[PDB]
Amino acid sequence: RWPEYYPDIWIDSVMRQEYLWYRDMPSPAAPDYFQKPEAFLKKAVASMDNGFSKIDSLLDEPIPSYGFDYTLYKVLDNDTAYNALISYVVPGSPAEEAGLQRGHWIMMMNGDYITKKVESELLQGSTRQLQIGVYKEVVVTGGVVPIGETTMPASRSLVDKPVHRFEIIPWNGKKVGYLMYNEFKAGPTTDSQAYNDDLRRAFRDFQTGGVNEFVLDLRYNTGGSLDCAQLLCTMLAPADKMNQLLALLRYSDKRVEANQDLTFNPELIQSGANLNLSTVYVLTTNATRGAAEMVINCLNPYMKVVLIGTKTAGEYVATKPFVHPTDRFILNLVVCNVYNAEEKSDYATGFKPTYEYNEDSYLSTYLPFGNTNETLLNAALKIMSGITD
Ligand SMILES: [Cl-]
């Protein structure tokens, strides 16, 4: 109706220049200078963009937190109450100092139940007193039973490292490398390789230990950098694949200059080690996304990749970050296709697992990462040994 806008908004410009699917954006509508970037984005993306592109805030530091992730389960006959099952504890966090571990359940906070009203108090706050429990079975009935209490310090701004857990497991005559790798991130700062060097260090330890089987746990890995992914692949692959094509990054017809052919590149190994493996077991959930899915797609043609868990996210294109000049947000925009050596990325809707295991259905084996009875790792160990068909 009104106003009558005259015939310059950054987000529209960065997208029309850099977006993989710029040709499939809606036609230039009437400008809306007050709309949130989120709202602009949702209306401007191509229909193929199923939440791949997204807006993220530019923060001075990570939002403070206690350092744990969880899932709520309704309490026995309490109307408003829930128990919080811990799924991940950040190293060096208040949660870890509290003595908390994956598989612990938070049952009370300072003598009060956890209700939907107070759920956000699990994310951050002051020092808290917690009643903690564990899932127990009795012969068969199961439930969360209290086992004790602890004091959790106040939340604080935390940095979580991608190399989350490491182990070498001897198992039925095999030497099994286990890696819980949670984010494709090279280092804490813009040009740091610190985490990639942590990854190399783990692979050097794996080679020293003579690992000949491998379980890569990407279950909560939401993605990140393809250069991290190239490094990881290069170190898992069979040794006769060095220098072969791994990934074909293909941008739009306006950004041909950016196209790249990534190989299994042995000069990337540096202080790490190639493990010369023929099979890899990859643990997945719906959270497993992007770069994490690229690893699966790109290793598929070259080795036996066995997927255990639940279907992956389906993010078959790569995003790159673009920072607004003044408004402090980041546009994570789809910029390229990422084909494997067979010229394919045909996992729209996600990679279906080879063997489906929902970790939430097996509460008695919801255990710390790397414990061999932990559901998804146990499955892999059984499958490689022929215990599970
Ligand atoms: Cl953990």
CSV table of all heavy atoms in Angstrom, one decimal, residues 88-89 102 164-165 369, ligand 1:
chain,number,residue,atom,x,y,z
A,88,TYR,N,26.3,-34.8,27.6
A,88,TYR,CA,27.6,-34.2,27.2
A,88,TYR,C,28.0,-33.3,28.3
A,88,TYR,O,27.2,-32.5,28.8
A,88,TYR,CB,27.5,-33.5,25.9
A,88,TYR,CG,28.8,-33.1,25.2
A,88,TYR,CD1,29.4,-33.9,24.2
A,88,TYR,CD2,29.3,-31.9,25.5
A,88,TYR,CE1,30.5,-33.5,23.6
A,88,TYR,CE2,30.5,-31.5,24.9
A,88,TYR,CZ,31.1,-32.3,23.9
A,88,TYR,OH,32.2,-31.8,23.3
A,89,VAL,N,29.3,-33.4,28.7
A,89,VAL,CA,29.9,-32.5,29.7
A,89,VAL,C,31.1,-31.8,29.1
A,89,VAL,O,32.0,-32.6,28.6
A,89,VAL,CB,30.3,-33.2,31.0
A,89,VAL,CG1,31.0,-32.3,32.0
A,89,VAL,CG2,29.0,-33.8,31.6
A,102,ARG,N,28.2,-37.8,31.7
A,102,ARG,CA,27.1,-38.4,30.8
A,102,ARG,C,26.5,-39.6,31.5
A,102,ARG,O,27.3,-40.5,31.9
A,102,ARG,CB,27.7,-38.7,29.4
A,102,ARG,CG,26.8,-39.4,28.5
A,102,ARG,CD,27.4,-39.7,27.2
A,102,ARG,NE,26.6,-40.7,26.4
A,102,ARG,CZ,25.7,-40.3,25.5
A,102,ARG,NH1,25.5,-39.0,25.2
A,102,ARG,NH2,25.0,-41.2,24.8
A,164,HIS,N,37.0,-34.5,21.8
A,164,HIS,CA,36.3,-34.7,23.1
A,164,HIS,C,36.6,-35.9,23.9
A,164,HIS,O,36.7,-35.9,25.1
A,164,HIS,CB,34.8,-34.7,22.9
A,164,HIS,CG,33.9,-34.8,24.1
A,164,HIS,ND1,33.9,-33.8,25.0
A,164,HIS,CD2,33.1,-35.7,24.6
A,164,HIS,CE1,33.1,-34.1,26.0
A,164,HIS,NE2,32.6,-35.3,25.8
A,165,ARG,N,36.8,-37.0,23.2
A,165,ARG,CA,37.3,-38.2,23.9
A,165,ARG,C,38.0,-39.1,22.9
A,165,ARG,O,37.7,-39.2,21.7
A,165,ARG,CB,36.1,-39.0,24.5
A,165,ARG,CG,36.3,-39.6,25.9
A,165,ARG,CD,36.4,-38.6,27.0
A,165,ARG,NE,35.2,-38.2,27.8
A,165,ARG,CZ,35.0,-37.0,28.4
A,165,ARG,NH1,35.7,-35.9,28.1
A,165,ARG,NH2,33.9,-36.9,29.2
A,369,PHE,N,31.1,-41.6,27.1
A,369,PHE,CA,31.7,-42.0,25.8
A,369,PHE,C,33.0,-42.8,26.0
A,369,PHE,O,33.8,-42.6,26.8
A,369,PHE,CB,32.0,-40.7,25.1
A,369,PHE,CG,30.8,-39.8,24.7
A,369,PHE,CD1,30.8,-38.6,25.3
A,369,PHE,CD2,29.9,-40.2,23.8
A,369,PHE,CE1,29.7,-37.7,25.0
A,369,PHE,CE2,28.8,-39.4,23.5
A,369,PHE,CZ,28.8,-38.2,24.0
B,1,CL,CL,30.7,-36.2,28.0
